[PDB]
Amino acid sequence: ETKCTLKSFTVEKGIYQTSNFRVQPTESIVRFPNITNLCPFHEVFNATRFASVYAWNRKRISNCVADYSVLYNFAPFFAFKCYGVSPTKLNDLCFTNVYADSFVIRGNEVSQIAPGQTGNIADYNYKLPDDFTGCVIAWNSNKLDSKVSGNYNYLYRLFRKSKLKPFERDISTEIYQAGNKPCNGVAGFNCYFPLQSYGFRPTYGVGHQPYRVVVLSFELLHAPATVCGPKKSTNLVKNKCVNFNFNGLTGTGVLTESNKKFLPFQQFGRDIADTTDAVRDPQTLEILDITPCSFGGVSVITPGTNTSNQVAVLYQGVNCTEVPVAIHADQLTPTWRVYSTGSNVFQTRAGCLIGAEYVNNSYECDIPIGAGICASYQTQ
Amino acid sequence: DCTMYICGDSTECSNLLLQYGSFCTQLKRALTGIAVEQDKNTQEVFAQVKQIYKTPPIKYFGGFNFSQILPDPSKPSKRSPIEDLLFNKVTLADAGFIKQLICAQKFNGLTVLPPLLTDEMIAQYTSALLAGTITSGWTFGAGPALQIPFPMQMAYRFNGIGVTQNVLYENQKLIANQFNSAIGKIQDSLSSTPSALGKLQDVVNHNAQALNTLVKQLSSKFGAISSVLNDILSRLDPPEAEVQIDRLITGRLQSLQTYVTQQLIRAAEIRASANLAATKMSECVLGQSKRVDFCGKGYHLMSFPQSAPHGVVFLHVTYVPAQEKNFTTA
Amino acid sequence: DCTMYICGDSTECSNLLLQYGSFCTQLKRALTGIAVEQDKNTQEVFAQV
Amino acid sequence: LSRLDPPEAEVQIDRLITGRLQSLQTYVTQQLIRAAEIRASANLAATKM
Amino acid sequence: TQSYTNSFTRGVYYPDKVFRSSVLHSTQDLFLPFFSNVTWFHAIHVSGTNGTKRFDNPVLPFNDGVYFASTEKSNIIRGWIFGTTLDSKTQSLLIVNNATNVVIKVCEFQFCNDPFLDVYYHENNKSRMESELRVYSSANNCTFEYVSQPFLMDLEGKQGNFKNLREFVFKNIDGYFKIYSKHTPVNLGRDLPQGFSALEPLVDLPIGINITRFQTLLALHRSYLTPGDSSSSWTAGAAAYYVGYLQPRTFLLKYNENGTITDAVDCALDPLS
Ligand SMILES: *[C@@H]1O[C@H](CO)[C@@H](O[C@@H]2O[C@H](CO)[C@@H](O)[C@H](O)[C@H]2NC(C)=O)[C@H](O)[C@H]1NC(C)=O
Ligand SMILES: *[C@@H]1O[C@H](CO)[C@@H](O[C@@H]2O[C@H](CO)[C@@H](O)[C@H](O)[C@H]2NC(C)=O)[C@H](O)[C@H]1NC(C)=O
Ligand SMILES: *[C@@H]1O[C@H](CO)[C@@H](O)[C@H](O)[C@H]1NC(C)=O
Ligand SMILES: *[C@@H]1O[C@H](CO)[C@@H](O)[C@H](O)[C@H]1NC(C)=O
Ligand SMILES: *[C@@H]1O[C@H](CO)[C@@H](O)[C@H](O)[C@H]1NC(C)=O
Ligand SMILES: *[C@@H]1O[C@H](CO)[C@@H](O)[C@H](O)[C@H]1NC(C)=O
Ligand SMILES: *[C@@H]1O[C@H](CO)[C@@H](O)[C@H](O)[C@H]1NC(C)=O
Ligand SMILES: *[C@@H]1O[C@H](CO)[C@@H](O)[C@H](O)[C@H]1NC(C)=O
Ligand SMILES: *[C@@H]1O[C@H](CO)[C@@H](O)[C@H](O)[C@H]1NC(C)=O
Ligand SMILES: *[C@@H]1O[C@H](CO)[C@@H](O)[C@H](O)[C@H]1NC(C)=O
Ligand SMILES: *[C@@H]1O[C@H](CO)[C@@H](O)[C@H](O)[C@H]1NC(C)=O
């Protein structure tokens, strides 16, 4: 490596500084705060008083912690075709509003509520905008919504002047003025009622089984995030060079307990050098301290390459009890580890020296190491 | 260290830095030379003598009182009282002994190496010089040291400035009392005014101050989105973030270059001062100087060296006339 | 003076320069030190009496 | 400033500021060396006096 | 009572959430200049057992934040109205605190001005203000809602000697209304005592309203301690209600060993500073 750092095949007597070593991290921690204020979706989903298809029941959703990972087991989900957006990755998107609604439909009208669709249910009852970016979830409801005589609890509209605009409701108990004769409520000939029954029977199987269905609107635009993901946390370790992401504070280093006192509103402290020293809330709340962990430089002591090949290594500013005598793979920066790292370790005020043994004699300085310590190539 | 200081352990930053070429092998070949030069300065200044002399166990020099300059065995560090006062006076911030917080965050790629000669062998050099100049006069600067009683040496030192020996051999007692009073009062004179040890203080200050600002430049926008490299990496896409990366890296490189350039000139000035000090010790101490105002003010008699943190302190013993009378000449 | 030279009487230029850190606090101390040294030079040569 | 709009005016002013700062630094860098030489000459003059 | 007084040296708040220990950090931000002019503003509506309309509560603007100080009995100045026009499109903030919870609803109203001051509101004998709240009179247009918990709970010391002065600072940079406040009852009857005190952050919320117009609505259902005279031309007149103003300046602040601001110095007040 010394031959490599300076382009030559020969090195003369002296001390050269090749490179530096740094302990690599081992673990990652993301310490997000507590997760409260869950979003109401079971409340919307869990009900037995759903409305009719022509007058469906709405819902507003605002700042709330939403986790779309609790409804999957609660319903059978015979049909789970949502919008084209990735159904699997739904826990990583943030929106400002969630306006939703629910109703019940028939077996033959599952897909009729889609953008650009027509029909009795899709024209005079509810049409969908072309750029609609909301999900659709439906599930069979024939077990509960069925009466042996008749489940006359829901209706449907069939007659209206034109096609309804998207995101609009047309609830009104008027009488259709069929033809040129002015039917003013008589409900006689050339006159009909724009509403009809939507009862259910036990015998109605494939083709007529009611499906309870809910859709919710997305509105993704340039606005502050309101409804977001869970932002799960992890565990903590002590006295181990690890990464961290405390409330969006990227950094790395060894971690210990914190001393001193913090004001209740203050979160992370600083110093004169404009660096971060202590932070808060790894889990629950407390004060904890970060510190850069061991790194340093390596110096190679060697005589002339035309005289010998043995070398000595000086690790600058590291404690001999904590020096990497292991110099293990991955965790340690220096790739070379075939070196002995044993039976020859000396502690010096300048660092730790490995490859030479102390002597009680005293001669002139040949290759100055430092702090009054000098090394030389000698015969035993 | 470049890679640590400029780049916050980011692969992209290191890869971009590699494109700039040899702006770091050039920026290390200078500081290593500066360090070697600094190490050589003290060795060239203090280590003028070859052999380490030891003061005689007894202490009596015909009325002269050297207790304030010779080493005092009671204290563990074997330093003279004046040396101890000098050490206490100077406030040192960082010494670099496994420091790992006034001076703790400088380990941001910056390191302070320790001096070769620990500030205990310097005491031995100073003690050897003092013993040689006390018990042997100026003859140990040329060949082998030769002993000679102190009053005779003082008589010849007077003879060196055109005053015959009878003056000393008849006013020995008064001269000894005056020298004792002066050497006693020098300590209070040092203790009175704080600015006396100005120059050395500045040497401790400026560099430290410089180091401080070299860290403060890390948190600077430099015209970029933010001073946090990871923040700009995560928040903005790779394909055009290299512009911000280049801006930050060139700003930090320029900041480091300025610091190195300042260090070079400061080292040059320090070398000039050290050469002057070496000349002063070689002339005033190991001999008697006939130059005017070079060794003290007035006619020169002797000099005594003492060590101080990153510096030397000379005590000049000089001869000055007094009240006069008129006369008529031909 | 930096502000007068680099960004002559324009607030936006001074605001933009403010992002460059301490590249002017350093540029004044050097010149003040040079001035003080110049003042001391003529004093130490002549004021010997 | 008058002819342009803030977005690219920022880039142009950045170029101008970095150029002018580079031109300014050289002045003090040369002044330091010249002052050192003058100080050496002054010390020689003081010794001669 | 419109009158001017010297601001002395007050109105300093923590500008960030970081923690520092014994440093001399410098900041550039919006502040209240030292030794400036603070204006009293007073409502005088009480006389005998007869109305005697006061025509009080004049117009007051809002220029990039404001500093407010009070010596309320317990909740006399509970009413605060911040809005662009207070009539329509304003979405004016209606914040009220009466020792239990606060309302931070953001809606448009023509006003909530319906004091309905009872003729038996004389504080000495009958102060029957129990459940007398015709607040947010009707509405103009809104769809936003928001609530929070109470802010100013004056800790009564069971005496009038501890005449507490509450201090508040309001600014709305890029949204996120900030209500830095300090509860220091250390005063005893001297107006604006000399000394230093910091302000702590409580809430923040983006609303997007250009807050231009500032006003209050007192609790006129119990009125007293309202003097008045011919005060004019830079004098003092009792108001129990002070108004200052803010501007972007640069300060130098000293952090205590524990982490509390202790001293501050202006950078443009005086050549010595
Ligand atoms: C001169 O020498 C004499 C002895 O030869 C010194 O006398 C004592 O020195 C010690 C040294 O610390 C003092 O603690 C004693 O107080 C001295 N004795 C007396 C009676 O005071 C004397 O100190 C020397 N002169 C000086 C200035 O140190
Ligand atoms: C002796 O020397 C002294 C000086 O030490 C002379 O005193 C000065 O003489 C000059 C001659 O004009 C006067 O102008 C000064 O005013 C004198 N000094 C003072 C303090 O008055 C003196 O003249 C010399 N000769 C004699 C005979 O005394
Ligand atoms: C709502 O949940 C309860 C228990 O989780 C369950 O018994 C009930 O059947 C659910 N509602 C419907 C309509 O299924
Ligand atoms: C936060 O969650 C933790 C989980 O154990 C628990 O302490 C508590 O429920 C919450 N509050 C605090 C203050 O920790
Ligand atoms: C190098 O060492 C060899 C011995 O292996 C010796 O013969 C040669 O002279 C040496 N050369 C130098 C330049 O030291
Ligand atoms: C360094 O190692 C020595 C040897 O045991 C130990 O006493 C000392 O506490 C260690 N210090 C640090 C900072 O690791
Ligand atoms: C060397 O010196 C040390 C003390 O400096 C002493 O303890 C030791 O016995 C000596 N001999 C050795 C290490 O062989
Ligand atoms: C003052 O107002 C009250 C309120 O009704 C009224 O009864 C009284 O007569 C008024 N005063 C006079 C002098 O009329
Ligand atoms: C206080 O109240 C009455 C009104 O009911 C008032 O006329 C009188 O001054 C006081 N009376 C008593 C009993 O305190
Ligand atoms: C900002 O203030 C202006 C008056 O200068 C006002 O007309 C405007 O409505 C305010 N902006 C908003 C968004 O209300
Ligand atoms: C600061 O802390 C020290 C010890 O932690 C304490 O004695 C002192 O009272 C504190 N200062 C305050 C709370 O102002």
PDB file of C-alpha atoms in Angstrom, chain E residues 44-113:
ATOM      1  CA  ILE E  44     -63.936  53.218  28.574  1.00  0.00           C
ATOM      2  CA  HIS E  45     -67.515  51.948  28.891  1.00  0.00           C
ATOM      3  CA  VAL E  46     -68.826  52.305  32.433  1.00  0.00           C
ATOM      4  CA  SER E  47     -70.744  55.130  34.120  1.00  0.00           C
ATOM      5  CA  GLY E  48     -73.446  54.850  36.775  1.00  0.00           C
ATOM      6  CA  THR E  49     -76.455  52.693  35.946  1.00  0.00           C
ATOM      7  CA  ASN E  50     -76.891  54.150  32.440  1.00  0.00           C
ATOM      8  CA  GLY E  51     -75.382  53.174  29.095  1.00  0.00           C
ATOM      9  CA  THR E  52     -73.679  56.388  27.915  1.00  0.00           C
ATOM     10  CA  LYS E  53     -72.328  54.899  24.682  1.00  0.00           C
ATOM     11  CA  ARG E  54     -68.536  54.943  24.515  1.00  0.00           C
ATOM     12  CA  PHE E  55     -67.723  54.595  20.782  1.00  0.00           C
ATOM     13  CA  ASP E  56     -64.625  52.679  21.878  1.00  0.00           C
ATOM     14  CA  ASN E  57     -62.515  49.959  20.200  1.00  0.00           C
ATOM     15  CA  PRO E  58     -61.051  52.022  17.332  1.00  0.00           C
ATOM     16  CA  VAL E  59     -59.350  50.711  14.207  1.00  0.00           C
ATOM     17  CA  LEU E  60     -55.927  49.071  14.570  1.00  0.00           C
ATOM     18  CA  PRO E  61     -53.708  47.713  11.771  1.00  0.00           C
ATOM     19  CA  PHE E  62     -51.397  44.687  11.680  1.00  0.00           C
ATOM     20  CA  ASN E  63     -47.949  45.174  10.124  1.00  0.00           C
ATOM     21  CA  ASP E  64     -45.899  41.955  10.113  1.00  0.00           C
ATOM     22  CA  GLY E  65     -46.642  40.682  13.603  1.00  0.00           C
ATOM     23  CA  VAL E  66     -47.483  42.511  16.807  1.00  0.00           C
ATOM     24  CA  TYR E  67     -46.536  42.554  20.495  1.00  0.00           C
ATOM     25  CA  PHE E  68     -49.303  42.709  23.100  1.00  0.00           C
ATOM     26  CA  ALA E  69     -49.224  43.171  26.879  1.00  0.00           C
ATOM     27  CA  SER E  70     -52.008  43.070  29.445  1.00  0.00           C
ATOM     28  CA  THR E  71     -52.899  43.230  33.145  1.00  0.00           C
ATOM     29  CA  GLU E  72     -56.317  41.577  32.902  1.00  0.00           C
ATOM     30  CA  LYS E  73     -58.487  40.756  35.892  1.00  0.00           C
ATOM     31  CA  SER E  74     -58.903  37.168  34.756  1.00  0.00           C
ATOM     32  CA  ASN E  75     -60.312  37.048  31.200  1.00  0.00           C
ATOM     33  CA  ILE E  76     -61.305  40.619  30.316  1.00  0.00           C
ATOM     34  CA  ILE E  77     -59.526  40.679  26.930  1.00  0.00           C
ATOM     35  CA  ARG E  78     -60.414  37.118  25.920  1.00  0.00           C
ATOM     36  CA  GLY E  79     -61.674  38.270  22.505  1.00  0.00           C
ATOM     37  CA  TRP E  80     -59.226  38.439  19.588  1.00  0.00           C
ATOM     38  CA  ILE E  81     -60.143  38.931  15.918  1.00  0.00           C
ATOM     39  CA  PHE E  82     -57.443  38.709  13.223  1.00  0.00           C
ATOM     40  CA  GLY E  83     -58.469  39.066   9.599  1.00  0.00           C
ATOM     41  CA  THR E  84     -57.897  40.672   6.232  1.00  0.00           C
ATOM     42  CA  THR E  85     -61.198  42.588   6.116  1.00  0.00           C
ATOM     43  CA  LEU E  86     -63.374  41.040   8.890  1.00  0.00           C
ATOM     44  CA  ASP E  87     -66.358  41.245   6.515  1.00  0.00           C
ATOM     45  CA  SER E  88     -65.980  38.723   3.675  1.00  0.00           C
ATOM     46  CA  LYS E  89     -63.166  36.695   2.049  1.00  0.00           C
ATOM     47  CA  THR E  90     -61.304  37.383   5.317  1.00  0.00           C
ATOM     48  CA  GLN E  91     -61.623  33.905   6.884  1.00  0.00           C
ATOM     49  CA  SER E  92     -60.883  35.793  10.089  1.00  0.00           C
ATOM     50  CA  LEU E  93     -59.450  33.867  13.033  1.00  0.00           C
ATOM     51  CA  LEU E  94     -61.763  33.761  16.053  1.00  0.00           C
ATOM     52  CA  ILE E  95     -59.773  32.749  19.144  1.00  0.00           C
ATOM     53  CA  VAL E  96     -61.425  32.861  22.573  1.00  0.00           C
ATOM     54  CA  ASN E  97     -60.225  31.663  25.982  1.00  0.00           C
ATOM     55  CA  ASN E  98     -62.337  31.857  29.142  1.00  0.00           C
ATOM     56  CA  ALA E  99     -60.298  29.583  31.474  1.00  0.00           C
ATOM     57  CA  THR E 100     -61.379  26.382  29.670  1.00  0.00           C
ATOM     58  CA  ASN E 101     -60.277  25.364  26.157  1.00  0.00           C
ATOM     59  CA  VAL E 102     -59.908  27.573  23.078  1.00  0.00           C
ATOM     60  CA  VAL E 103     -61.658  27.809  19.718  1.00  0.00           C
ATOM     61  CA  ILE E 104     -59.389  28.125  16.689  1.00  0.00           C
ATOM     62  CA  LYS E 105     -62.128  27.932  14.072  1.00  0.00           C
ATOM     63  CA  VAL E 106     -61.227  29.668  10.807  1.00  0.00           C
ATOM     64  CA  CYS E 107     -64.361  31.100   9.206  1.00  0.00           C
ATOM     65  CA  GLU E 108     -65.706  34.233   7.544  1.00  0.00           C
ATOM     66  CA  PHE E 109     -68.092  36.405   9.547  1.00  0.00           C
ATOM     67  CA  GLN E 110     -69.475  39.891   9.093  1.00  0.00           C
ATOM     68  CA  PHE E 111     -68.518  40.321  12.775  1.00  0.00           C
ATOM     69  CA  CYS E 112     -69.273  38.946  16.221  1.00  0.00           C
ATOM     70  CA  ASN E 113     -69.972  42.492  17.462  1.00  0.00           C
TER      71      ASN E 113
END
